[PDB]
Design a protein around this ligand. Structure first.
Ligand code: FAD
Ligand code: 64X
Length: 630
């Protein structure tokens, strides 16, 4: 009898397959001849974009320990090429077939395929990915279309990439939506670029949820009246967050689009523009789009007639080429029959950690948890270790399964509270989720075991990437020690984010919100760093056009657009003139102090002032309890 059957092989299954091979656990892989989105993109020649996520968080530890030399954003092509190298390694283990049904019994499953071949497996892993409605617009939709109006109903990473490809052909973009959360994928810290995922210091939640909340949420919730922030210049981008019923911030179920702010795009690519664009580094600055009016927001309830293909805003009945419904995404599960008979119904909240479903035996879900920021690799790598330990160690299987029902209840209380199930429940802050899996497995770190200030930085400030937990113990990866030193050496041991937490320990929500926005350039949606980039933007559009052999005339005028843009940008034409310290000042001093006491013993530190008292209490954080683990 087959010990393990993995269904679907793309990206998510790689780490688990690796661990099963290591313990010589008997496994077979079944995966469709047709492959995935990435093969459609490959063969239609549309691997012509880059990831929104850092190398550090998008490629697995066993690759990073060989190939990390610096932070960069991988291209679509580099991501697919990495899928194809790992497929080649394991191709002998893969049956090319399509699973149509799983019949789940007490300690085994009967798997049906389209060939009609049947397989019996004690443990079954689904790593089948998602059906995504937007994939067609990326796969197929045309790059010649020009000067048309498009209406999007929702704003996600796919819509934002499509908008990036549309804008250089003078296509006009209308977002009719109930707000969206966008974040600069990169932040300049004392002149050095940090991806946003490197600045979240998530283990500060254990100190207090209130402190973690005021440190993180001012770019998301409208807490500052600083007139430089997009959610003040363009109030329509604001969301209804009344659904949120949890002390854990940022909450599970929050989604953001991550985008290149034009200032950082310039710093990276100005020097060799066309060649960078040709590689898939595309400018997707939604905030620069709202600034220059190439995108406009209109109310959620703005009247639209699909019969005549017109939207009614600014007293103008406006004609559009295409309405884009908006990315719904569904896990590609085959029919699963409970005890051979009753169809299983998938709901994220009814699985433990997005992996273990109820009323099924020895069936695990790999790849159906989405990270709030950073790449999927961090999530799937930790899920792979969790599944590996559940499949190979019966004691661990029993320990998790015995009280599965109450772990799930305790998880849902902590992270969702009394909120109704939502379609984005599957979205988790990466640094909570990786840490949660690490504590479940026992490869986590103990704050009490920190000895030096250096150790405290590693524990609190070093990002909770999967490879953080493969330094030592049960799932150690060779070379992770040198990886961490490289990453620490390049990011000043994450002293800046440690200092951020220190700066707001004694503030309230509102004070923290003002402080986070006092910078010359604050991290997210800073509308002061747009105007001075218009010259660069034309160099960009021209370079893009040259790359894609496009002709277009920038003298054509859509006076109806102008009335709608000016109607749209009314609040901005009021607020932006009100524009015009602390964060820049506090960071620069804090970092000097911290770097000075790096190798100082914590326990020994004497009685600036209560910042030492605070640093000492980090050995004994008061909000460490996670009842889905304990
Ligand atoms: C446009 C786009 C951009 C993305 N950008 C990023 C990014 O910047 N950073 C990031 O970290 N992530 C990103 N992702 C998300 C993620 O990294 C990819 O979706 C990834 O391909 C998911 O890998 P997977 O193994 O879960 O699924 P897939 O890659 O889809 O692989 C699943 C495989 O299972 C097969 N299969 C499905 N059902 C069956 C069945 N019943 N029987 C047999 N075989 C089956 C499929 O044919 C496929 O070959 C992006 C996704 C998309 C679509
Ligand atoms: N005070 C932090 C906020 C931050 C940093 N990184 C983040 C990522 C997601 C979200 Br929501 C917030 C952040 C910063 O500005 O560096």
């Amino acid at each position: 009898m087959l010990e393990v059957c993995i269904i679907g092989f793309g990206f998510s299954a790689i780490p688990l397959v690796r661990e099963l091979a290591r313990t010589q656990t008997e496994f077979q892989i079944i995966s469709a001849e047709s492959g995935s989105v990435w093969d459609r993109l490959s063969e239609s020649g549309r691997l012509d974009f880059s990831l929104v996520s850092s190398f550090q968080t998008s490629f697995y530890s066993f690759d990073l320990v060989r190939d990390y030399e610096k932070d960069y954003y991988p291209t679509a092509k580099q991501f697919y090429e990495m899928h194809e190298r790992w497929r080649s390694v394991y191709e002998e283990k893969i049956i090319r077939d399509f699973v149509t049904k799983i019949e789940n019994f007490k300690d085994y499953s009967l798997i049906s395929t389209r060939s009609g071949k049947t397989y019996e497996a004690k443990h079954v892993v689904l790593a089948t990915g998602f059906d995504r409605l937007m994939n067609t617009f990326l796969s197929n939709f045309d790059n010649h279309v020009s000067n048309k109006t498009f209406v999007f109903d929702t704003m996600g990473d796919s819509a934002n990439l499509l908008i990036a490809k549309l804008i250089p052909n003078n296509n006009k973009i209308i977002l009719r939506t109930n707000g969206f959360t966008a974040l600069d994928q990169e932040v300049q810290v004392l002149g050095k670029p940090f991806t946003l995922d490197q600045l979240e210091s998530p283990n500060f939640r254990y100190v207090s949820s209130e402190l973690y909340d005021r440190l993180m949420m001012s770019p998301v919730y409208p807490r500052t009246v600083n007139p430089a922030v997009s959610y003040n210049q363009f109030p329509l981008i604001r969301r209804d967050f009344s659904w949120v019923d949890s002390k854990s911030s940022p909450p599970n179920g929050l989604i953001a689009i991550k985008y290149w702010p034009i200032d950082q795009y310039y710093y990276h690519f100005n020097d060799d523009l066309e060649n960078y664009i040709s590689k898939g580094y595309l400018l997707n600055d939604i905030a620069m789009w709202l600034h220059t009016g190439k995108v406009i927001l209109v109310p959620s309830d703005t009247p639209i007639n699909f019969d005549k293909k017109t939207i009614t805003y600014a007293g103008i009945e406006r004609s559009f080429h295409q309405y884009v419904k908006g990315d719904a995404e569904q896990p590609r599960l085959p029919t699963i029959l409970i005890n051979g008979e009753t169809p299983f119904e998938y709901l994220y909240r009814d699985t433990f950690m997005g992996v273990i479903p109820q009323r099924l035996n020895n069936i695990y879900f790999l790849g159906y948890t989405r990270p709030f920021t950073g790449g999927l690799a961090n999530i799937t790598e930790m899920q792979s270790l969790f599944i590996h330990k559940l499949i190979t160690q019966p004691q661990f299987h029993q320990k998790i399964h015995q009280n599965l029902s109450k772990r799930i209840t305790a998880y849902n209380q902590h992270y969702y509270g009394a909120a109704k199930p939502r379609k984005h429940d599957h979205t988790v802050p990466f640094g909570f989720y990786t840490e949660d899996i690490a504590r479940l497995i026992g490869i986590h770190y103990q704050p009490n075991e920190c000895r030096s200030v250096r150790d405290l930085l590693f524990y609190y400030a070093f990002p909770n990437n999967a490879f953080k937990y493969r330094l030592k113990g049960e799932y150690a990866v060779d070379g992770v020690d040198e990886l961490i030193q490289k990453v620490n050496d390049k990011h000043d041991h994450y002293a800046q984010v440690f200092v951020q937490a220190l700066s707001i320990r004694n503030m309230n929500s509102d004070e923290a919100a003002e402080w986070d926005h006092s910078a010359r350039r604050f991290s997210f949606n800073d509308m002061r760093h747009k105007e001075g980039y218009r010259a660069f933007l034309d160099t960009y559009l021209k370079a893009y056009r040259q790359v894609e052999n496009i002709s277009v005339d920038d003298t054509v005028v859509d006076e109806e657009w102008n009335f709608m843009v000016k109607e749209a940008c009314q609040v901005r034409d009021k607020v932006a003139p009100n524009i015009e310290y602390s964060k820049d000042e506090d960071v620069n001093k804090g970092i000097r102090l911290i770097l000075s006491i790096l190798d100082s013993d914590i326990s020994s530190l004497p009685d600036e002032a209560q910042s030492i008292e605070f640093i000492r209490r980090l050995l004994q954080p008061k909000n460490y309890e996670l009842l889905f683990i304990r």
